[PDB]
Amino acid sequence: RVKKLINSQISLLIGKGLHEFDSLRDPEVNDFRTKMRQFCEEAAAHRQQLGWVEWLQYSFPLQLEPNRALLVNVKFEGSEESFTFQVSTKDMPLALMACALRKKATVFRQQPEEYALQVNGRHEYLYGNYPLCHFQYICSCLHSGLTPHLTMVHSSSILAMRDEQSNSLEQPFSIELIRKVNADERMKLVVQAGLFHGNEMLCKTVSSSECSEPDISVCDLPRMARLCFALYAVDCPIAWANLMLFDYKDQLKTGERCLYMWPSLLNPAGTVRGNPNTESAAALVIYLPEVAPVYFPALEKILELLYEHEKDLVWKMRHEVQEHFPEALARLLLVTKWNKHEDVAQMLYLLCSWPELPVLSALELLDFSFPDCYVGSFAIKSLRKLTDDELFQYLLQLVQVLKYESYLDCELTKFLLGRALANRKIGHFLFWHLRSEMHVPSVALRFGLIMEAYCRGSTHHMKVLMKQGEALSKLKALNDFVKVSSQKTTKPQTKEMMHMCMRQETYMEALSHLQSPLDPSTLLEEVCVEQCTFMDSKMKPLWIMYSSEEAGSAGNVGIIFKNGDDLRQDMLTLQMIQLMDVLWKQEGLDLRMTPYGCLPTGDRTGLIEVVLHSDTIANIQLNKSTAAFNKDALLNWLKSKNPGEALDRAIEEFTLSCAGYCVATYVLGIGDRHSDNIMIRESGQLFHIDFGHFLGNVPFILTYDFVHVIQQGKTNNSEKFERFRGYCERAYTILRRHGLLFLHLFALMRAAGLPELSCSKDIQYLKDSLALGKTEEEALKHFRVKFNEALRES
Numbered sequence: 125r126v127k128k129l130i131n132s133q134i135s136l137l138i139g140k141g142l143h144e145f146d147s148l149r150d151p152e153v154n155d156f157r158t159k160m161r162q163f164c165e166e167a168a169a170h171r172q173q174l175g176w177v178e179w180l181q182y183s184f185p186l187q188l189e190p191n192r193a194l195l196v197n198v199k200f201e202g203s204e205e206s207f208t209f210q211v212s213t214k215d216m217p218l219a220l221m222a223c224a225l226r227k228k229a230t231v232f233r234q235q236p237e238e239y240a241l242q243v244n245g246r247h248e249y250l251y252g253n254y255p256l257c258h259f260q261y262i263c264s265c266l267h268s269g270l271t272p273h274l275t276m277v278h279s280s281s282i283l284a285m286r287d288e289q290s291n292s293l294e295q296p297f298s299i300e301l302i303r304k305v306n307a308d309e310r311m312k313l314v315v316q317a318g319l320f321h322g323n324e325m326l327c328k329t330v331s332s333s334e335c336s337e338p339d340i341s342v343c344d345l346p347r348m349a350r351l352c353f354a355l356y357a358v359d360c361p362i363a364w365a366n367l368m369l370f371d372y373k374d375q376l377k378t379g380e381r382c383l384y385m386w387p388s389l390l391n392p393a394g395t396v397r398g399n400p401n402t403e404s405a406a407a408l409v410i411y412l413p414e415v416a417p418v419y420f421p422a423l424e425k426i427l428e429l430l431y432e433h434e435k436d437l438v439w440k441m442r443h444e445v446q447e448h449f450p451e452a453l454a455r456l457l458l459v460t461k462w463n464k465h466e467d468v469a470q471m472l473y474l475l476c477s478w479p480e481l482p483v484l485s486a487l488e489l490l491d492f493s494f495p496d497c498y499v500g501s502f503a504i505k506s507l508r509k510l511t512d513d514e515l516f517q518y519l520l521q522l523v524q525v526l527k528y529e530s531y532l533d534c535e536l537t538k539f540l541l542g543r544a545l546a547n548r549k550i551g552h553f554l555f556w557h558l559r560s561e562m563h564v565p566s567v568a569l570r571f572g573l574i575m576e577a578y579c580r581g582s583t584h585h586m587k588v589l590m591k592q593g594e595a596l597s598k599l600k601a602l603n604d605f606v607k608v609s610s611q612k613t614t615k616p617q618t619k620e621m622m623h624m625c626m627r628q629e630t631y632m633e634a635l636s637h638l639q640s641p642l643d644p645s646t647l648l649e650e651v652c653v654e655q656c657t658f659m660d661s662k663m664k665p666l667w668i669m670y671s672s673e674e675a676g677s678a679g680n681v682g683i684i685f686k687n688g689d690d691l692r693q694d695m696l697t698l699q700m701i702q703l704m705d706v707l708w709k710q711e712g713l714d715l716r717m718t719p720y721g722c723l724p725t726g727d728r729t730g731l732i733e734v735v736l737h738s739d740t741i742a743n744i745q746l747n748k749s750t751a752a753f754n755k756d757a758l759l760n761w762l763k764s765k766n767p768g769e770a771l772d773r774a775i776e777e778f779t780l781s782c783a784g785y786c787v788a789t790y791v792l793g794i795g796d797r798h799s800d801n802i803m804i805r806e807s808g809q810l811f812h813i814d815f816g817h818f819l820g821n822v823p824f825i826l827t828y829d830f831v832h833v834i835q836q837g838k839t840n841n842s843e844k845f846e847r848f849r850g851y852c853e854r855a856y857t858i859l860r861r862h863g864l865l866f867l868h869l870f871a872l873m874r875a876a877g878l879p880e881l882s883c884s885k886d887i888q889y890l891k892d893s894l895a896l897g898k899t900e901e902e903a904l905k906h907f908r909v910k911f912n913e914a915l916r917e918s
């Protein structure tokens with residue numbers, strides 16, 4: 125009964141019963157299940173014998189940054205008696221722990237290596253040989269002015285958490301086209317079939333001969349060949365269906381197949397698995413002739429065997445390309461004749477001795493343009509260099525790429541699960557990236573199986589994620605109530621009844637004491653029902669506040685629950701802005717950005733992190749007790765929050781972040797920016813919210829109200845204004861240098877099916893906004909023309 129409880133909890137957590145998997149009687153699903161279960165359990169066991177600092181690295185990974193004084197409050201576990209030391213920002217955490225043990229021995233009338241520093245009320249720790257200034261928490265405290273509050277956790281306490289979290293021939297390829305079709309009975313049904321190796325067509329779309337019931341050799345068919353079908357009417361499309369010619373066991377598939385079709389001509393990128401709705405979906409009846417069994421040649425036997433003329437020169441000096449331009453691998457792989465086994469064996473032989481490639485080259489090889497499993501394994505082999513922080517930075521894209529995957533057991537799934545089971549922060553976001561897509565039939569089996577496998581290697585983490593899902597379940601029930609109620613009573617009345625609903629023990633228990641799905645290190649402790657509310661927008665989003673005594677003012681955390689809108693594009697936009705910030709900070713440029721959390725959790729559902737101490741441009745402009753001129757409202761609000769000496773740092777914070785968001789919204793093509801979706805923090809930091817439109821679905825924007833604040837309220841201020849232009853120019857030139865990184869990641873995101881990231885037209889927008897094909901001088905002059913055009917429009 126220890127397994128019956130665990131399995132039913134897994135079913136509940138992943139949003140799919142484990143019985144649904146068994147009832148498929150699918151040897152592939154069964155073989156992924158048992159192989160991945162052992163893989164995950166091995167990792168769980170390796171983790172149960174790690175050292176206490178290694179366990180800290182696992183569950184609470186360090187939050188770092190991409191000579192000065194510091195007052196720090198430090199206390200111990202099991203004692204309210206705090207102590208305020210005065211350490212330097214250049215000191216290591218071990219120096220503070222020695223200071224704390226010195227003050228502890230002096231009071232209690234009495235070794236810092238057996239201790240770790242916990243950030244109060246958070247699952248965040250400070251340990252290692254890193255100066256305090258470089259820990260994100262100390263950095264954030266220094267800028268905010270706040271005193272860092274830490275707790276001296278001993279090794280015997282950390283080890284108790286580890287001990288509490290236990291458990292053949294030239295015969296040309298041919299098909300026989302032998303069902304619930306719904307189309308105009310007056311016209312006729314036609315099926316178009318195409319052979320594909322990724323994007324590349326292996327031969328030519330062999331269509332069919334024009335009711336409700338209806339040039340390639342077999343020896344040259346590549347390992348990952350796709351037979352792609354399209355049911356049209358004769359141009360109105362009806363359905364599509366794809367399948368792999370070779371099975372998961374490398375054997376060539378033979379005999380009849382029933383292809384359950386997806387409703388819409390050819391969709392090569394679409395999954396190679398049938399529609400699960402085997403009741404209403406249209407089906408195609410096909411037959412695979414008998415070649416003999418024939419299993420795709422092994423690596424041992426395989427290794428034994430731009431204009432048109434430019435591609436033939438790249439292929440001729442293919443060995444010179446490996447030995448002198450190894451990074452040009454994708455250029456030669458994209459020129460290889462994938463419909464000729466003779467050239468594919470010669471090309472795969474080169475890839476077997478090809479040196480490793482930088483992560484930027486590996487992220488390119490993960491695109492759909494490279495479906496070969498050998499070239500794909502080489503990509504994950506180069507992708508292991510990825511640091512846990514870099515892997516987190518691209519985790520969303522690596523999850524979308526699983527949609528291109530042709531079989532369930534794959535080296536990307538093995539890698540993602542291996543890296544997830546070695547870091548609880550990576551296992552956390554991998555969980556939510558898969559959980560949030562469980563309502564999508566095409567990914568539900570794949571994602572459902574991965575989440576199950578992870579759960580086998582993390583039974584304690586499953587219980588922690590269960591607590592999150594229960595909170596999200598209650599938030600949907602409270603949000604549906606709020607939607608119905610708001611259409612029938614005054615807002616104050618609905619707010620009072622939302623609070624009574626929340627005050628029920630079913631809700632107080634479920635909504636309290638959980639890790640935030642937006643950030644596992646933020647602990648959501650007591651829900652402040654008096655401070656919770658909903659916004660007046662269509663989906664009545666909930667504004668939920670939390671407090672924690674243990675963390676003081678830092679435990680005051682807000683989250684926004686939204687049901688009814690897709691949050692993926694917002695998440696993507698924010699991740700890109702965070703990447704820009706990391707790139708800018710890597711080149712010594714801190715633009716004081718605010719890349720707050722956005723995490724989709726389910727069907728048109730997700731969370732948004734509340735940034736407290738901020739208001740919208742429109743609310744500051746309609747102040748609540750004056751400005752003689754509206755142009756002075758923002759500057760006056762900044763004066764209200766930053767008296768005397770402080771006003772200068774606030775105008776600087778505004779200038780830097782304004783330059784960052786001006787460049788980010790410009791480069792990413794984010795339009796429809798107005799006083800409602802632009803906010804200012806009391807520090808001066810300007811940031812944007814609600815990114816429902818990107819890639820021009822856009823000129824540089826210079827708002828007069830912001831230029832007035834940048835100019836310290838002066839009508840003419842070239843010293844201030846031109847320093848601002850320098851920031852825009854630097855941030856735009858740093859992002860241009862990493863243009864290939866955004867293009868590769870955006871190319872990987874084509875797998876997500878976001879409507880504003882659909883064809884090459886959308887990717888072209890980024891190339892033009894980043895002016896990549898130009899020299900750095902010509903691009904900077906072009907940006908200058910578009911920036912000067914924005915000041916005149918201001």
Ligand SMILES: C[C@H]1COC(=O)N1c1cc(-c2cnc(N)nc2C(F)(F)F)nc(N2CCOCC2)n1
Pocket residue numbers: 659661665684686694720732733734735736738740803813814815
């Ligand atoms: C200004 C406040 C008041 O009325 C709002 O609507 N507000 C919103 C709205 C939103 C938001 C952002 N993106 C998307 N797609 N949707 C929303 C919403 F919650 F409305 F659904 N976010 C905030 N933030 C608060 C400050 O820290 C960051 C998050 N506040």
